[PDB]
Amino acid sequence: KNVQIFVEKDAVETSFEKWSQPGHFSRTLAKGPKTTTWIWNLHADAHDFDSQTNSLEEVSRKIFSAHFGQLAAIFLWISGMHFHGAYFSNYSAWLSDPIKIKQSSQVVWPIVGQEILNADVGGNFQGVQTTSGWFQMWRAEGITSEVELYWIAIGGLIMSALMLFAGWFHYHKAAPKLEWFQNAESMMNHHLAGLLGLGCLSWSGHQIHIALPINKLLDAGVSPQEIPLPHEFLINRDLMAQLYPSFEKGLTPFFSGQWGVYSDFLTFKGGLNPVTGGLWLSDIAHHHLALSVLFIIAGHMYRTNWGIGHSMKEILEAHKGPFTGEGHKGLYEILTTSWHAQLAINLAMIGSLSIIVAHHMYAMPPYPYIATDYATQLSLFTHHMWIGGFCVVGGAAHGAIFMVRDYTPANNYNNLLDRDLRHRDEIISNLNWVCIFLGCHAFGFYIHNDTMRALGRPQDMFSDKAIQLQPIFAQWIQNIHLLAPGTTAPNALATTSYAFGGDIVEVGGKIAMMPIKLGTADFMVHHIHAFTIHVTVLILLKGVLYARSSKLIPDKANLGFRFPCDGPGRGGTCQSSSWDHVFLGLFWMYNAISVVIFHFSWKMQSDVWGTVTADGSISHITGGNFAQSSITINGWLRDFLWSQASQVIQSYGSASSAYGLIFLGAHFIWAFSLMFLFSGRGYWQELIESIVWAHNKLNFAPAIQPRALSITQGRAVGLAHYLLGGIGTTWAFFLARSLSIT
Amino acid sequence: PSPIFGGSTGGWLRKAQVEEKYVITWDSPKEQIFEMPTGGAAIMREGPNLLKLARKEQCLALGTRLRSKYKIKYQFYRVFPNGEVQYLHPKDGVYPEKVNAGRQGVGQNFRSIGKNVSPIEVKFTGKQPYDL
Amino acid sequence: MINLPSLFVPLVGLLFPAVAMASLFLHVEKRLL
Amino acid sequence: GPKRGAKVKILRKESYWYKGTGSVVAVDQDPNTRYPVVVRFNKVNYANVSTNNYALDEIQEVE
Amino acid sequence: DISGLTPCKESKQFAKREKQALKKLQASLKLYADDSAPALAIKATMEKTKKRFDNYGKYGLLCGSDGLPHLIVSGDQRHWGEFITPGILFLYIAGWIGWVGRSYLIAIRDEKKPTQKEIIIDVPLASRLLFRGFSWPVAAYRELLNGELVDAAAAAAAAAAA
Amino acid sequence: SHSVKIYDTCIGCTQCVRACPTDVLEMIPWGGCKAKQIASAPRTEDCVGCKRCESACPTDFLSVRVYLWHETTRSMGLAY
Amino acid sequence: MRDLKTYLSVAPVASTLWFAALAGLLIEINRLFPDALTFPF
Amino acid sequence: ANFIKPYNDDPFVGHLATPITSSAVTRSLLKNLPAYRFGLTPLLRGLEIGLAHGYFLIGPFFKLGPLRNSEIALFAGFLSTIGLILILTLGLTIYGAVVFKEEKVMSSANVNNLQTKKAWDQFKGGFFVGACGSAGFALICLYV
Ligand code: CLA
Ligand code: CLA
Ligand code: CLA
Ligand code: CLA
Ligand code: CLA
Ligand code: CLA
Ligand SMILES: CC1=C(/C=C/C(C)=C/C=C/C(C)=C/C=C/C=C(C)/C=C/C=C(C)/C=C/C2=C(C)CCCC2(C)C)C(C)(C)CCC1
Ligand SMILES: CC1=C(/C=C/C(C)=C/C=C/C(C)=C/C=C/C=C(C)/C=C/C=C(C)/C=C/C2=C(C)CCCC2(C)C)C(C)(C)CCC1
Ligand SMILES: CC1=C(C/C=C(\C)CCC[C@H](C)CCC[C@H](C)CCCC(C)C)C(=O)c2ccccc2C1=O
Ligand code: SF4
Ligand code: SF4
């Protein structure tokens, strides 16, 4: 057998000795501090496990146990939330009337006049309005009572302590060997079939037996109280056959292969629930079933201990064309002997996933009563755009850490990796052009519109009334999705989303979904999206390809991943390291995602969101100003930023006045960053010397000598304040704007 | 006797045939793969090896990787467009890190650094404080 | 006269800089001078 | 002059440790050496260096 | 009075601020039933608010035409409670910290590893030192006229210039 | 070209010569210090100016010193 | 447990305990004697 | 099989011979363009080039012009193609006035060379004739 369990017993003694010696993990820091730079190095190097030991087995043991610690903090986080929903919320009052009661799971103490933050939300309750969608998620599970939330909170605490115990057990008591970690084919079979497959099967089981029948009674108008205990849905088929009259057959049409009997709970109707404005739970139960069969079957594609199956190595090595040379040879050693190469894939995938997740939750809203909560819709969408943005660049950082540290030329003669490095001047110069081509056109469309309008010539602007730029490719695709129910998807009753066209869904007088028409003002913005992604890719790609050498520095790989420069000769060598490429690309991701959430917040408010009256008279939030006000920069500056600021700037004395303070606080922090980004270290260290003198004059000085922040560190400070202040100012602007319109 | 390489776009430019170009020679006891300063990989040939580069640093960077990583030792040349060659590294066959009888003093101030003159003293002259 | 701005502004705005940018280019790129 | 183990004050102006005190470790008896005296310090400079060579006219003795 | 200001107990605009602040909380109070937790919280808030206006009225503070309290820092002894008396208080606590912290650095300086005791505090020693700064104006004065407060000019390193 | 000067506080520990990436400095015989060797700058025209030599010099202040000078194609560090 | 005591004496642990005790000092005084613009009380 | 090798069997030269660089299509196509054709006077080299450029520079001026919707939409833009060609020619005069050097020895056995001062002048004047003439040619072809 090749797949076995290898574990070392009693590997590391558990004592408080090392806790009292900061910097024990590295060879240079263990001597103790001499300057204040030591304190900074202590934190920057604490998780760099690769630079602490040379053994791959010891690095892998540290990573494994740290995953248990990360999960234990997530369980504690989840257990808190459920606890707040059970003791500091208005969940019951919300369940009885989820159109008038606003949501809240946080209560502040009254101590310095801050009680004003407890808003008058409803249901004889005062608290801070929360926009995480905990409530809607609980209704979809069929919660209905605070008691049930309490058990989740106790079970979250127990799981959290189980994780803490497992991470301690696997690092000190039962430390598993290197052979165990290097089992990719086994690991893939378990994550596909076990984690994802049995996860979707059991979840589907909860949805069919507990979540489906409770939701049917809530939707029909039954008060929570009259709904029976969830376990009573598991015992009496009489209760289950009244709602879905195919339980009288039981489980026999499943083993006879007559699955169309269950069309009561395995639907493919599409659209949304006219009552709640969320997806049909019956579609979601079918969704998890079809997934779980796919995941369990996919977890049999690899060979472990029995002959049958694929070896990952013979797959990749078979793929070689006459342009690619050796093709995929060597990518195994890479992806089974280096943790950096793994994160580079994984973070790029998980970050892309969170972006994908945010696009699908506003167009096909999966929870009930969430589509008309515009504060939740807006908050959840931007959040995943940010988390997606950070993880994507984080994949590119580890790709460049891999090229510097784990990459070897002898392991890769003439393969795809070796070949990319060989024409790296061609990838970068061609990308460079595509960037100069996309920016001059997409941003120059706005300038033209800014000058034409200012010169009194609107007849010559790129608009829906002048020179049109109609997005005909995306309009063509919308028609296909609209005509799809019946033809291309003959068993589908309605379209996947109403964005491609169809009818208007409304819950409580508010609009949940509407067709989203695309015109030339849409078209122009989509290129800005195109353009800012291509530039971000230009910086990160360049950092990975030139991580080891350049024409400028031939021995860049000997200097390391993150070095400040190679001196003021050879012209300027500042920011040549691949860490500095990651540093620059963080500012672009920021630039790119900011335009995305600006585009989403304004298009939804202009052309979807709003209320209605008799004869379907739709009144939008900003009244349809999107086709003729977003084609110029002045229109974006005056109608989006200036007009919609009125809430956050007039929030004083109200319950949303914390958003006005955090608004100013983040404008302050953002400006504070510019002191670190524009200046440099040797002006600050001379400044410290005059200060130290005033201390020496008075007979005292710290024995840990004060030293200015280093070149690399002064950049990482200025970037962290730039993001914090920038994202924060928008955070405060988005919530005080959307709480006032929801 | 050029090593085994499939080519790359990071090689020499016009500067080579118009301005000075550099070659480097080394002797290897066996066939081993090394990293190119302008390219990712290449197999060196047993016996003498000849490589053409565009900068002195690129040539010297390869030497450093050939020294403490493979235990071998090399010669640098400057080649002009007309055809005149120059012999550069090592200057006198002996490495610059090891003292060799016969070398001379170039560019040495016979005092410590705090002993330089004020810039107002050398006013209106065509020099500098560190050239006195 | 009242007809003067439609004569000078193309001359000053388009003609003078095109001659001046041409003149400086020749001077900057001239080897023995 | 100093001996081995004497505590001196640096009088070099461009030294990191001007007007500062420290301890003589070795004095080269050969007078061809221009800076014969190794003086050690307990605080490091900006390059994290702990010692330096000096001449006899650049150090003062404390008591 | 000073600057044409009026005292707050006699300001017509300070009284209007008191009424409108109470009216705002009463109109929020009417939407709740009398025994419930939101009605008891807003009733306690109007007591806190009403005590805030009463306190200022007799405080002896000065109001303007805006109706807000103003502070006088010329040095008048009649408005001492505004700056002098809380000023002397802060000086006592700020000079207490600086004195005590300096005692610590000077104490652990004569040692093998002084830097070790700045990242990892000798707490028994630190605790002792922290409370010896209660008589700092006497202790900082004894060292000034001793020679142990300020060092000599030949003990400070100086930049090449001077 | 750039200017590289070498002062008499040089203790001759060869660390600048081992750090130079373009072979500008070398060690020569000298009778003024324990190691009887001083650094020398015979080929300052290959000097790119990156100052790696000064980051390696242990004396305080430095024995080796680089001063910015007129730039050629060699000190600009161009491969074109 | 002389090593846990040295761990509790490290600068960031002492800083959070000292601040926690000192923030709560100011919060408690502002709970009993609130709104003290000046000495007037 | 390998479709990528070092250009001209020189592995250290910084170029790659791919089917975009050196294939039978791109070889025969580039060898017959007027900037690289064997047997052309430098006037003729500039004439052709100019003949093919002035003809399509017309288009964006006549269609997306400031006076595109007027009865003098064709005139407006043709004039502005001539003004574009005057700027381009001006860039050709100054480039050759500085890149090439005057010849001492009347010795001239290659009067055909393009990369010289005398021929560049002929090449520059041929560009101006062919581009103003092709601007006028589709003035006739569009007036229909
Ligand atoms: C809003 C942005 C911003 C801010 C806040 C500062 C702040 C500062 N800069 Mg500046 N700087 C900026 C932008 C900014 N910079 C930009 C764009 C540049 C161009 C690169 C520079 C370039 C620059 C240089 C060259 C110099 C400064 C200096 C200073 C300091 C001036 C002294 C001072 O104001 O003490 C007050 C301290 C602050 C305002 C920092 C905020 C501290 C907060 C947390 C205090 C909160 C208030 C209150 C005390 C709360 C009590 C605390 C609690 C624990 C009880 C201070 C740290 C000089 C300096 O360092 O001299 C001392 C200096 O020489 N900066
Ligand atoms: C069916 C088997 C199975 C399952 C479910 C998992 C599940 C997981 N593995 Mg894993 N693994 C397996 C087999 C399995 N592995 C094998 C055989 C190997 C050796 C090749 C590995 C080697 C491995 C490594 C090296 C790492 C993981 C990690 C992880 C976690 C990924 C993070 C995540 O998505 O959190 C989702 C979290 C949850 C779903 C919570 C579940 C918490 C526990 C574990 C419950 C599962 C136990 C049991 C099946 C539940 C029974 C339910 C009951 C009602 C019947 C996840 C908990 C990573 C990790 O985080 O480690 C800590 C990691 O670094 N695995
Ligand atoms: C699963 C995700 C993941 C993992 C495991 C790692 C792991 C690692 N990364 Mg990495 N990284 C990630 C995501 C990840 N990263 C992402 C998303 C990015 C892009 C932003 C990066 C960018 C990145 C760079 C650029 C570098 C690393 C480095 C490292 C290594 C050492 C990290 C360390 O010691 O930090 C210790 C941790 C800290 C010092 C914490 C500070 C975190 C910030 C400053 C505070 C956050 C603010 C907070 C959330 C809000 C504040 C609010 C305020 C009011 C208080 C380690 C291998 C470094 C390295 O050397 O690689 C080997 C390195 O140079 N990574
Ligand atoms: C508003 C501020 C601003 C602007 C305009 C730019 C502009 C640019 N940056 Mg950026 N950059 C900025 C802030 C800005 N940056 C900041 C704050 C940072 C610090 C983090 C950086 C860091 C940075 C890096 C690291 C990179 C860039 C890149 C680029 C270039 C993108 C290519 C392109 O489309 O150019 C086209 C020009 C524009 C989009 C702007 C003007 C558009 C005009 C109006 C249309 C055409 C005009 C025409 C040509 C001339 C006619 C007018 C004239 C006759 C008067 C471009 C020059 C990237 C690059 O060079 O890749 C190619 C790159 O890698 N920048
Ligand atoms: C780059 C962005 C951009 C674009 C696309 C336009 C587009 C336009 N502007 Mg402009 N404009 C811009 C930026 C831009 N503007 C900026 C930044 C400003 C502010 C300074 C202005 C200010 C401005 C004014 C004041 C005016 C215009 C006008 C115009 C119009 C005509 C211009 C014209 O005839 O040019 C000539 C065009 C060309 C010579 C086209 C060359 C490009 C060709 C097609 C490229 C072909 C590439 C080809 C595919 C390569 C493959 C070859 C291979 C197949 C062999 C046109 C709609 C005028 C108007 O009336 O508007 C209607 C006008 O009066 N613009
Ligand atoms: C300050 C000086 C200045 C002046 C006087 C002008 C004048 C003009 N511009 Mg211009 N421009 C300038 C600066 C200036 N520009 C700058 C700095 C920019 C870049 C930001 C632009 C960008 C710009 C654009 C994008 C456009 C103009 C256009 C125009 C024309 C106005 C529209 C119209 O009715 O013409 C309509 C034009 C005609 C009816 C025919 C005019 C044909 C000309 C006069 C032929 C000139 C021939 C001659 C050989 C030119 C030699 C040039 C050189 C040697 C000096 C007019 C000729 C528009 C244009 O060219 O229209 C086609 C146009 O699209 N301008
Ligand atoms: C929310 C939450 C929670 C909770 C959770 C839970 C409650 C879970 C559950 C879960 C579950 C409760 C699961 C279940 C599972 C089950 C399963 C998964 C089953 C399966 C089975 C099967 C698969 C079968 C098979 C078969 C057949 C069909 C036939 C033949 C025979 C056999 C046996 C083979 C916690 C506390 C953690 C924390 C916080 C959060
Ligand atoms: C798109 C595309 C393409 C391309 C194409 C092209 C690019 C074309 C061009 C074309 C052109 C661009 C053409 C031109 C033409 C021209 C002409 C046709 C001219 C004419 C002229 C004439 C005939 C003459 C004139 C004159 C003179 C010179 C003198 C005076 C008199 C006259 C006026 C007569 C391809 C194939 C790749 C592929 C597909 C796509
Ligand atoms: C200001 C600045 C410094 C000076 C900053 C230093 C020396 C760091 C000071 C951090 C202190 C010591 C940490 C403690 C923070 C404050 C004592 C408390 C502020 C927090 C409030 C909320 C209380 C640099 O060292 C530097 C280096 C390189 C580029 C730019 C710069 C730069 O801009
Ligand atoms: S400046 Fe750089 S290249 Fe010049 S001698 Fe010093 S280390 Fe060598
Ligand atoms: S200059 Fe510095 S590195 Fe060079 S020999 Fe002297 S002490 Fe050593």
Author numbering:
A (entry chain a): 16 to 757
B (entry chain d): 79 to 210
C (entry chain i): 2 to 34
D (entry chain e): 2 to 64
E (entry chain f): 77 to 238
F (entry chain c): 2 to 81
G (entry chain j): 1 to 41
H (entry chain l): 29 to 172
From the paper:
Among the two PSs, PSI drives electron transfer derived from water oxidation by PSII to ferredoxin, leading to the generation of reducing power needed for reducing CO2 into sugars. Diatoms are a main group of the red lineage and play important roles in oxygen production, CO2 fixation, and biogeochemical cycle of carbon and silica, which account for about 20% of the global primary productivity. Both PSI and PSII of diatoms bind FCPs as their light-harvesting antennas, conferring a brown color to the algae different from the green color seen in the green lineage organisms. On the other hand, diatom PSI binds more than 20 FCPI antenna subunits, making it the largest antenna system found in the eukaryotic photosynthetic organisms and supporting the efficient survival of diatoms in the aquatic environment.
Structure of the PSI-FCPI supercomplex was solved by cryo-EM at an overall resolution of 2.38 Å and a local resolution of 2.2 Å for the PSI core based on the “gold standard” of Fourier shell correlation (FSC) = 0.14335. The overall structure of the C. gracilis PSI-FCPI is an asymmetric heart-shaped monomer when viewed from the stromal side, in which the PSI core is composed of 12 subunits, including PsaA/B/C/D/E/F/I/J/L/M subunits and 2 previously unidentified subunits PsaR and PsaS. However, the diatom PSI lacks PsaG/H/K/N/O/X subunits, among which PsaX is present only in cyanobacterial PSI, whereas PsaG/H/N are found only in green algae and higher plants. Two previously unidentified subunits designated PsaR and PsaS were found in the diatom PSI core.
